[PDB]
Amino acid sequence: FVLTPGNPRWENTHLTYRIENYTPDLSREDVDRAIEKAFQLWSNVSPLTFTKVSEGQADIMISFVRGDHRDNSPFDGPGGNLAHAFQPGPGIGGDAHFDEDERWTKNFRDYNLYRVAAHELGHSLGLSHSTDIGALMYPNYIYTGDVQLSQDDIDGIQAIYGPSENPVQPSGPQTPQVCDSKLTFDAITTLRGELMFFKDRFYMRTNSFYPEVELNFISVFWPQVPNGLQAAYEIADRDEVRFFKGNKYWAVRGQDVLYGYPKDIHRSFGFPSTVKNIDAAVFEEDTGKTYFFVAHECWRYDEYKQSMDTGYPKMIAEEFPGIGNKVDAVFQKDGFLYFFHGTRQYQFDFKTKRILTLQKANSWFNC
Amino acid sequence: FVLTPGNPRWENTHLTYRIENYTPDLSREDVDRAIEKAFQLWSNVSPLTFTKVSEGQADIMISFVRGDHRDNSPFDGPGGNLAHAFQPGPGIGGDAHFDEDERWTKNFRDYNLYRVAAHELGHSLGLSHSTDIGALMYPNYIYTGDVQLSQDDIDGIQAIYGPSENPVQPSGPQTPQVCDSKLTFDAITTLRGELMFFKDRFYMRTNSFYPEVELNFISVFWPQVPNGLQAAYEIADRDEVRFFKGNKYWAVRGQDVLYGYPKDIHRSFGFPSTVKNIDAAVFEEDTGKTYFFVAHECWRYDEYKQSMDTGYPKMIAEEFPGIGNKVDAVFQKDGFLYFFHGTRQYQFDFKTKRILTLQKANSWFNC
Numbered sequence: 097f098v099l100t101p102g103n104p105r106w107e108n109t110h111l112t113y114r115i116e117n118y119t120p121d122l123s124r125e126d127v128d129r130a131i132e133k134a135f136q137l138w139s140n141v142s143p144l145t146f147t148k149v150s151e152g153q154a155d156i157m158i159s160f161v162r163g164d165h166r167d168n169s170p171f172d173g174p175g176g177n178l179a180h181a182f183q184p185g186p187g188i189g190g191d192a193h194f195d196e197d198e199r200w201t202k203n204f205r206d207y208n209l210y211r212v213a214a215h216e217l218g219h220s221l222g223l224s225h226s227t228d229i230g231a232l233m234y235p236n237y238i239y240t241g242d243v244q245l246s247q248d249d250i251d252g253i254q255a256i257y258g259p260s261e262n263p264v265q266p267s268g269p270q271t272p273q274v275c276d277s278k279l280t281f282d283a284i285t286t287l288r289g290e291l292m293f294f295k296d297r298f299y300m301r302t303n304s305f306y307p308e309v310e311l312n313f314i315s316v317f318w319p320q321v322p323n324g325l326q327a328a329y330e331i332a333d334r335d336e337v338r339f340f341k342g343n344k345y346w347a348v349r350g351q352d353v354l355y356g357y358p359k360d361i362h363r364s365f366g367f368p369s370t371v372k373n374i375d376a377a378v379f380e381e382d383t384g385k386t387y388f389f390v391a392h393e394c395w396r397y398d399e400y401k402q403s404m405d406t407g408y409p410k411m412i413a414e415e416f417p418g419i420g421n422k423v424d425a426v427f428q429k430d431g432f433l434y435f436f437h438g439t440r441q442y443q444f445d446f447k448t449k450r451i452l453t454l455q456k457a458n459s460w461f462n463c
Numbered sequence: 464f465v466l467t468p469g470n471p472r473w474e475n476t477h478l479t480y481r482i483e484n485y486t487p488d489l490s491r492e493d494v495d496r497a498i499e500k501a502f503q504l505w506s507n508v509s510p511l512t513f514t515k516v517s518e519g520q521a522d523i524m525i526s527f528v529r530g531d532h533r534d535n536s537p538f539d540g541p542g543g544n545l546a547h548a549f550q551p552g553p554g555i556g557g558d559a560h561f562d563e564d565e566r567w568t569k570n571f572r573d574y575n576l577y578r579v580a581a582h583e584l585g586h587s588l589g590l591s592h593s594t595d596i597g598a599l600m601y602p603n604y605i606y607t608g609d610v611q612l613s614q615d616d617i618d619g620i621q622a623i624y625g626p627s628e629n630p631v632q633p634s635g636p637q638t639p640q641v642c643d644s645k646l647t648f649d650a651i652t653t654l655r656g657e658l659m660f661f662k663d664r665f666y667m668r669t670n671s672f673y674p675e676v677e678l679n680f681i682s683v684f685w686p687q688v689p690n691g692l693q694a695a696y697e698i699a700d701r702d703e704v705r706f707f708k709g710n711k712y713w714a715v716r717g718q719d720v721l722y723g724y725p726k727d728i729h730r731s732f733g734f735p736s737t738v739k740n741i742d743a744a745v746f747e748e749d750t751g752k753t754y755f756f757v758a759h760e761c762w763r764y765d766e767y768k769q770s771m772d773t774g775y776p777k778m779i780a781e782e783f784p785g786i787g788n789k790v791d792a793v794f795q796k797d798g799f800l801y802f803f804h805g806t807r808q809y810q811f812d813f814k815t816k817r818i819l820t821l822q823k824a825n826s827w828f829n830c
């Protein structure tokens with residue numbers, strides 16, 4: 097997070113605000129909620145309260161404009177520059193203007209008003225752009241399926257107005273820290289010569305030649321793929337990748353999900369009803385079998401046929417010796433299998449059934 | 464169109480080019496075609512030829528970069544700034560760099576490489592930003608479902624290199640000219656207190672308080688709605704709008720198309736097989752009937768039931784006296800019906816069945 101230079105903050109924490117004019121793109125009530133919801137998220141985590149008015153001045157005047165509207169910052173027409181706001185102060189301070197040449201929407205479609213309103217307000221309250229890719233106060237429009245504050249937006253505003261507003265103190269999603277040594281993973285698949293590490297809403301891409309990891313949203317990379325992946329594996333020859341969440345899985349062939357693919361793990365793979373979700377999975381390309389890890393059970397699956405090999409709910413402890421009782425994520429690189437659990441990973445030699453080395457979870461991260 | 468100051472143009476019309484490096488987002492061949500297709504569209508309409516190479520320099524070096532890459536224009540990470548290029552000249556002249564922090568896609572999804580490559584190249588060849596909303600050389604990313612050159616991009620490049628490359632001289636879509644007095648319409652529906660005029664890929668919005676018309680893409684406004692609409696009408700009480708193309712129609716309730724709606728005019732409305740498409744349509748809210756215009760036949764349709772009123776393929780000439788043999792577009796405002804045909808429109812009094820005044824098609828356009 098970054099606080100605006102000179103530290104402009106509203107001297108009282110309760111403010112008025114007023115929607116001077118409405119966009120013909122949305123009904124009045126729809127424009128009425130994009131705004132209060134935008135205001136709402138800054139309240140939930142600090143002591144700011146807000147009263148909407150319909151006459152006279154208010155601290156935060158909100159207008160839909162376009163082109164030159166006389167404030168030494170004219171808009172640019174359709175796209176590009178969407179909106180802007182002014183830091184705490186009298187007159188124009190706190191004011192937010194949105195570009196009417198934009199199609200203001202109520203869904204994922206280009207230029208969700210709610211998404212833009214939450215950005216501009218953090219300004220109106222004293223905040224500047226965050227370098228955090230997941231923060232709503234990042235500088236560019238990236239819509240992700242909802243509009244929620246990450247931990248960064250929260251620390252920025254509480255750094256000006258202190259905490260509160262849900263005295264069961266609020267927590268917001270923290271964007272993954274690549275070199276933070278307490279970092280653990282949800283899933284990991286090797287993917288066409290690179291490694292795709294998954295965590296919450298984020299993917300950490302690396303390996304093939306990267307001067308550092310690339311952090312960004314799962315949803316900016318792929319269409320259907322959920323957040324909170326549980327396992328993700330790859331089948332190279334079928335130029336294919338699979339993702340798992342709860343009892344469902346999506347298969348993807350380069351850039352998009354295969355025909356009618358969010359499907360069932362129980363129907364497609366043959367799992368007991370007790371199997372409410374999986375923990376990791378790896379296509380062992382030598383033997384042509386995928387291993388699914390469920391708590392402390394390793395299932396082997398004849399990929400080429402769907403033949404769950406003879407019974408197979410086995411003890412990981414007897415199958416893959418020395419790694420433990422559970423797995424976080426696993427992949428196969430250079431022939432080895434990299435088994436993850438917490439912050440430690442084990443280099444396993446599948447052929448001699450013995451751990452060769454123990455390394456950190458972050459070793460591939462150029463840290 | 465706008466030509467770059469100092470008029471930088473490549474002194475020979477055949478150029479080499481080379482893709483120094485490829486994006487892991489797309490296979491090599493997919494990155495190979497976004498580029499040649501991008502180059503291709505500038506060829507089709509001028510005398511420029513291009514040879515792709517794989518070693519040594521070339522006039523147009525193309526690289527995927529990110530951040531500071533040392534040219535006094537560093538990228539900004541994910542979103543915002545997507546790419547940039549340099550005018551005709553030695554060394555860096557003609558060179559195009561694309562931001563790798565962008566998810567490079569092969570479809571409508573955010574940041575289609577083909578769409579961006581066509582923009583940057585017009586630069587490499589000597590062009591600057593057009594104020595034409597429909598031009599690929601407009602300054603902001605607006606993807607519309609394809610990547611085609613409008614008439615503006617064409618006139619700009621032929622203004623530097625003269626015509627040719629399909630000696631059946633190419634033509635490209637001209638963006639509607641609001642006040643050009645030779646302008647005619649495809650369809651027109653009044654829409655919640657404003658008027659939506661349709662033409663090709665574009666909508667011209669006006670009326671309720673507008674200090675001029677708003678020109679932009681049909682596809683930036685609505686999801687499913689085709690280009691080349693034939694008729695569009697509204698049913699206010701059902702807060703609903705309908706669009707027509709060939710033998711199909713979409714119904715829309717505020718911002719998106721109703722459930723499973725691209726449907727059949729013959730199935731839904733009861734039209735003879737001879738009815739391959741319609742010309743205009745208007746919900747006459749007084750009588751509760753919609754009139755469909757087909758060549759020189761007016762059909763009346765009991766909207767509240769789907770009862771095509773008794774036979775009804777009638778003579779427009781006897782139904783709506785004095786307007787003619789065909790209609791371009793029609794709507795109902797202030798009780799009157801505004802009948803369009805070419806560049807002239809007729810104010811009709813539905814109750815006295817007589818034209819009150821004749822005006823231009825552009826009269827509502829603040830021209």
Ligand SMILES: CNC(=O)[C@H](Cc1ccc(OC)cc1)NC(=O)[C@@H](CC(=O)NO)CC(C)C
Pocket residue numbers: 175176177178179180181211212215216219234235236237238542543544
């Ligand atoms: C898809 N478009 C974008 O992502 C543009 C990129 C851009 C930024 C600035 C600009 O001219 C200064 C031109 C283009 N970003 C914006 O509109 C941001 C403007 C801003 O920071 N408001 O406080 C608002 C977003 C973050 C909600």
Ligand SMILES: CNC(=O)[C@H](Cc1ccc(OC)cc1)NC(=O)[C@@H](CC(=O)NO)CC(C)C
Pocket residue numbers: 175176177542543544545546547548578579582583586601602603604605
């Ligand atoms: C969704 N994003 C956008 O529309 C941004 C908006 C923007 C522009 C400039 C900028 O910093 C200068 C920051 C943001 N446009 C761009 O990337 C254009 C850059 C350009 O003109 N290349 O020749 C390329 C498009 C037209 C294909």
Ligand SMILES: [Ca+2]
Pocket residue numbers: 154155156157185186187188189190191
């Ligand atoms: Ca103010």
Ligand SMILES: [Ca+2]
Pocket residue numbers: 171172173174175176177178195197198
């Ligand atoms: Ca804009």
Ligand SMILES: [Ca+2]
Pocket residue numbers: 119121195196197198199200
């Ligand atoms: Ca608008």
Ligand SMILES: [Ca+2]
Pocket residue numbers: 281282283325326327374375376423424425
């Ligand atoms: Ca897991």
Ligand SMILES: [Ca+2]
Pocket residue numbers: 521522523524552553554555556557558
């Ligand atoms: Ca060059």
Ligand SMILES: [Ca+2]
Pocket residue numbers: 538539540541542543544545562564565
């Ligand atoms: Ca960028």
Ligand SMILES: [Ca+2]
Pocket residue numbers: 486488562563564565566567
């Ligand atoms: Ca990329």
Ligand SMILES: [Ca+2]
Pocket residue numbers: 648649650692693694741742743790791792
């Ligand atoms: Ca028509």
Ligand SMILES: [Zn+2]
Pocket residue numbers: 161165167169180193
């Ligand atoms: Zn402004």
Ligand SMILES: [Zn+2]
Pocket residue numbers: 215219225235
């Ligand atoms: Zn901003």
Ligand SMILES: [Zn+2]
Pocket residue numbers: 528532534536547560
């Ligand atoms: Zn550059």
Ligand SMILES: [Zn+2]
Pocket residue numbers: 582586592602
């Ligand atoms: Zn440009």
